[PDB]
Amino acid sequence: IQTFSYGLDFRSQLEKIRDLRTRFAELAKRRGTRLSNEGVLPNPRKPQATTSLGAFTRGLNALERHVQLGHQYLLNKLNGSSLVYRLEDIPSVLPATHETDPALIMRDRLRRLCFARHHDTFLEVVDVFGMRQIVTQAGEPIHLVTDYGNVAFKYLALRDDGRPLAWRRRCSGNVVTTRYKAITVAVAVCQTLRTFWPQISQYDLRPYLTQHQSHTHPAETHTLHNLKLFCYLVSTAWHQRIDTGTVLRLSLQEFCVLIAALYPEYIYTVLKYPVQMSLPSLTAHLHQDVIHAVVNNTHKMPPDHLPEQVKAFCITPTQWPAMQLNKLFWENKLVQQLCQVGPQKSTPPLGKLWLYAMATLVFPQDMLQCLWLELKPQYAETYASVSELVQTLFQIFTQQCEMVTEGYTQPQLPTGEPVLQMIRVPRQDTTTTDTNTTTEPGLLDVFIQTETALDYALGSWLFGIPVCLGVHVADLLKGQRILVARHLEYTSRDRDFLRIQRSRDLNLSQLLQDTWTETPLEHCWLQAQIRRLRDYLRFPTRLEFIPLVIYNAQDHTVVRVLRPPSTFEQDHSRLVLDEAFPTFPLYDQDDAPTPPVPFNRVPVNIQFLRENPPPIADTSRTADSALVSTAFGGSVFQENRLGETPLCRDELVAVAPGAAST
C-alpha cells in the first residue's frame, strides 16, 4: 500500500483485505482465543511475537477504514465536479518518482490544515503504517479530508520559501505603452475641462489677440488660455461647415470635450502653430460625417473606424441591456466549485483570486508587467509586480488561521491509534460581537467586492474570450448618450490577441512534480483537473465577439457592462451646437491660403500646457513631446526576435520597444 504497487484499484485492495480478515478469523477460531478490539495497532518496529491477535484485528480495521474512506472521498469529488464523469477515466500516477521529505511533508500537512472548510479539532498520531500523521475526531487523515482544490493553490503553499521568486532570478531578465499613456493624457484633460468649465468659460480671450502683446499673462494662465482658445477655435471651425431622424443640441463645453477626445492632435496643433495659420485648416479638416458616425455609434462594436481615425465613440444606454461577465470568467459554477474550499464559510469565493493566480503563473512575465503598468489599480498601487498581490494575499490567508493546543485525557481514540498531540484551530476572523459594528476592511475585503478592468482583461486572455474596454468620459444629453473612449478591444482578427493564446503554456505538469507530497489519490485528481482545464482552455467558447466593458479612470473600477441589441436603425441625428457665448470678430483675414496643419502627433507629456502661447503668423519637440497616430493605431503587442542565446518565456514575447518608453 505504501509503494502504491496496485495503483488506483481500490476494489482489489478491499477484497484482499476482507480475505485477509477471513484467514485471520479462521486462525483465531482455531486457537480458541477470543478477539480483543481494545488493543493498539501493531508496530513494525516492535517484535511481531509480542504483538497480539487483537492488535492485528485493529490494524486490519485501520487499513480497511483508510481504503473505504479514500474510495468515498473519490466518489464525493466525482459527484461535486462535472468535468470528470466516471472513476476509470483517471489514470494511476506512477510511483517512479519516490521522494519523501519529512520536514516538507510536515509543512505540507500544516499548510493544508488551514484549508479545512470549517474550524475543526485535529490531533497528531502515527498511522498503522508507522508514519506520523494528523487525523480528525472521526480519524480522517489530513491529506484525505482536506484538499487544496487547485494544483496551483497547492504549489503556492510550498513555493513561499525565502525569496519571493527564484524562477525570475534563473531567467535573469518599468515600460509603459503609448496607447495607455495617450488615453490617460486625453482623459485627464477632458475631465478637467468638464469639471471647471464655468471658470474657463469666463476667461476673456479677446484682449490677448487685440493687444498683440504676448507672454504678459502668468505661467498658470498658459493652460486656461490654451484650452479655452482651443475649443473656441473648435467652435469657429464648426460654425462654417454647417452652412453647406432627431435633432440634438450640444452645449459649447460638450462640443469642446467631444472634439478634444476625437483627435488628440489638436491640442499640440494649437501650441505648434498660430491661430491665424490654423483657422482655415482647422475649419476645413473637420467635418460632419465622422462626427455623426461617432455620436450615432450603436449596434456596432468594435467601432467601424480604425483606432487611427477615431478615438472615442458614443453609446446609447437604453438600447444596450445588462450582461454578467462574472459568470463567464470567475463566477462560473465550475470555478466556484474549484474555489469553494476555504478556511471558513464566511470567506468569499476565490474564483477571482484563483483567476489572477492563473494569470500570474501561466502567462509570460513581461506581458503581465506591461498589462499591470497599464491597468494598475488604486488599491494595488502600493505593490509593483504582478506576483506581489498573490504573495501578499496568500500571506494574509496564512495569517488568518492560528494555532492553540489542548490536551486530551484519553491517550487513545476508540480506533486505538496513539495520540501524540492535539491541535486546535482558533477562528480568528474579526467577527466577534464588539458592538462597534465599524472596522477598517482588510485588503481582501475591499479586494473581493471591487472589480477592475484588469480582472476582465486577464479573464479574456486566459479563457480566450473577447472583451472591449471603454474609458468613460461623461454622460451626456441627460444620459441620452454616453462618452466612451477607445482603450482596448478584443477581436480574433488581431494578430497580438491570436498570438497570446498560444504564448501561454498550458502544460501544468511542472506544478505536479514540483510539489510531490506522497499522496497518489490527490496527485491523480489534480492531474485530472489539469488535463480537463487544458482541454477547456484550448477551445474557447465564442459569443460572436461582442462583450463590452466600461471602467473608471481614477480608481480603475468597472462602471457598466453592455450588449448590442439585434435590431438596428439609422439614427439620422442632426447635431446643432447651441450658441450662447459667441466668437470674437475675425481680424485682417477677410475681404495665398495658409498651409494645413499636421494632424499626426498625439502628445505624451503634460508639460506642453505650461508652454507659451503660439506666436502670431523644434523638431525634437515634435518627435518627443508628441507621438505619431499611425504607430498608435497599430497593435502595440509584439514578439521579440529569436537570438543565439535562448530567450525566456517572458522574453520571447514583448511589447514593441520603439513605441513604448523604457
Binding site: A284, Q309, T491, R493, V597, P598, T622, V628, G658
Partner: protein
C-alpha cells in the same frame, strides 16, 4: 494558375486567369442586365457628345439617345485609354514608376531603416510601406506647414516651371538635358534636398540614392540617376499620387452605413459572392495589387493599378480653368481625343504621342489640386458623388480601382 485580388474588406480574393478588368466588365454586362444600369452623369454627357458625331457613333455603337445605359466597348475604351495615359515606350519604360517611388522613399527612409533590419529587395520596401508612410506623411506635412510661398505658390506640388513650348514628356536632347528649375517648385524636392536625399540637381538652387538604385537594380536587370533622364518626374508624381490616395482613403473606414443601392452581390449574382483583419485600408490592397501583381508583371505602373482617379483629376483641372496650352501665359473633353487618335491608324504616331502627352500633363495638373487643398478627401468625395454616383467609400474604393461605378437609376 489563377491570380488573386482581394482588396475588398468584406470579400475574399477573386480568382481569375487573365484580363482582370476585361473579365470583370464582361461578367458585368453578361450576368446582369445593364438596361437600368447608369454610370455618372459625366458619362452621360460623353454619351451625348459621342452620339452627336456620326462616325464615332458608329465606331462606338450608341443606338439610343435618352437612356443612361453605356455600351460595354465604350467602358473598355475608357479603361484602356486611362491605362495608356501613363505607360510609355519612349524610354521603353525600362524603369517602371513604382520602382522610382520606392527608391525615392527608400533614400529618405534609409535613416529609418537603420533601426530595423536593412532591406535589400524592392518587395521588402513594398512590405514596409505601411511602416514608411507615417513618417513620410509627418515630414511632408511639417514641410507643408513651413511653406511660406517663396516661389510662385498657387498650388504646392510639382512641375510648375515646365516650358510652355515643350509639349513632350521626355526632354528632346537624348533625354538628358533639362530647362533649369523645372522642379524648383516641387514641394518634396524642397523636402529631400533639405534632408540631403538628393544632394545635386541641375538647375536647382555621392547621391546615396543613385548608388543604392544601382546596387539593388543591377541584380534584377542583370540604372538611370535622377539627373540622367526622365526617371526624375515619374517617381515623384506616382509617389505623390500614392500619398494622396493613402490620406484620402484612410481618412474614413469602409464599414460606414451603406446609403447607395449598389452592391457587388447585385453585380456578380448571389452565387458568385456566396462562392467567394480590420486594419488600415491599404493593408488589404498590399498583398494583392502591390506584391503578387508585381510578381506577375513588374513593368505595370500606377495608372494600370488605379485608373479611377484619372477622371477625377482631369475634371478638377478642368474646374480650375487652366489649360495645357496656356500655362498661365477650346475643347473641354481631354479624354475623347486620345480615343479618336487610337480608333483609326491613319493618325500619325508623333501626333498621337503629342496629344497623349498633353492629356498626361493635364492629368498630373489635376492630380496636384487634390493634394494641394486642405480638404483632399472632401473635394474628391463631393466631386465623385456628383459626377460618378459615388454614394459611399465602399463604392469609392470600387470606383477608383475599376474606373467605373454602375448603378440602377432608382430615380
Amino acid at each position: 494558375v489563377p491570380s488573386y485580388f482581394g482588396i475588398t474588406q468584406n470579400d475574399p480574393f477573386i480568382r481569375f486567369h487573365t484580363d482582370f478588368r476585361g473579365e470583370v466588365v464582361n461578367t458585368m454586362f453578361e450576368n446582369a442586365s445593364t438596361w437600368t444600369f447608369s454610370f455618372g452623369i459625366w458619362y452621360y454627357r460623353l454619351k451625348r457628345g459621342l452620339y452627336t458625331q456620326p462616325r464615332w457613333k458608329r465606331v462606338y455603337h450608341l443606338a439610343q439617345m435618352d437612356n443612361f445605359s453605356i455600351s460595354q466597348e465604350l467602358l473598355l475604351g475608357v479603361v484602356n485609354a486611362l491605362e495608356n495615359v501613363t505607360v510609355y515606350p519612349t524610354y521603353d519604360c525600362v524603369l517602371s514608376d513604382l520602382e522610382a517611388a520606392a527608391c525615392l522613399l527608400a533614400a529618405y527612409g534609409h535613416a529609418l531603416w537603420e533601426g530595423r533590419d536593412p532591406p535589400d529587395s524592392v518587395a521588402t520596401v513594398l512590405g514596409e510601406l505601411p511602416q514608411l508612410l507615417p513618417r513620410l506623411a509627418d515630414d511632408v506635412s511639417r514641410e507643408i506647414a513651413a511653406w511660406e510661398g517663396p516661389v510662385a505658390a498657387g498650388n504646392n506640388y510639382y512641375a510648375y516651371r515646365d516650358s510652355p513650348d515643350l509639349r513632350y514628356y521626355m526632354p528632346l536632347s537624348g533625354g538628358r538635358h533639362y530647362h533649369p528649375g523645372t522642379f524648383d517648385r516641387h514641394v518634396l524636392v524642397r523636402l529631400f534636398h533639405k534632408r540631403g536625399v538628393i544632394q545635386h540637381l541641375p538647375g536647382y538652387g555621392d547621391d546615396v540614392l543613385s548608388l543604392w538604385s544601382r546596387r539593388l537594380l543591377v541584380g534584377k536587370l542583370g540604372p538611370v540617376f535622377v539627373h540622367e533622364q526622365q526617371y526624375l518626374r515619374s517617381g515623384l508624381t506616382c509617389l505623390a499620387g500614392l500619398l494622396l490616395l493613402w490620406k484620402v482613403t484612410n481618412a474614413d473606414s469602409v464599414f460606414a452605413p451603406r446609403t447607395g443601392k449598389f452592391t457587388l452581390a447585385d453585380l456578380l449574382g448571389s452565387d458568385a459572392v456566396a462562392g467567394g483583419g480590420r486594419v488600415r485600408n491599404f493593408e488589404f490592397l498590399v498583398r494583392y495589387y502591390i506584391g503578387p501583381w508585381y510578381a506577375r508583371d513588374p513593368a505595370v505602373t500606377l495608372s494600370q493599378l488605379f485608373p479611377g482617379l484619372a477622371l477625377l483629376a482631369v475634371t478638377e483641372s478642368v474646374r480650375s480653368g487652366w489649360d495645357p496650352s496656356r500655362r498661365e501665359d477650346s475643347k473641354s473633353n481631354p479624354v475623347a481625343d486620345y480615343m479618336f487618335a487610337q480608333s483609326s491608324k491613319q493618325y500619325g504616331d508623333l501626333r498621337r504621342l503629342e496629344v497623349h502627352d498633353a492629356l498626361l500633363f493635364h492629368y498630373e495638373h489635376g492630380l496636384g489640386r487634390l493634394l494641394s487643398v486642405t480638404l483632399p478627401r472632401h473635394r474628391v468625395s463631393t466631386l465623385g458623388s456628383s459626377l460618378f454616383n459615388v454614394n459611399d467609400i465602399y463604392e469609392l474604393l470600387y470606383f477608383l480601382v475599376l474606373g467605373f461605378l454602375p448603378s440602377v437609376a432608382v430615380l
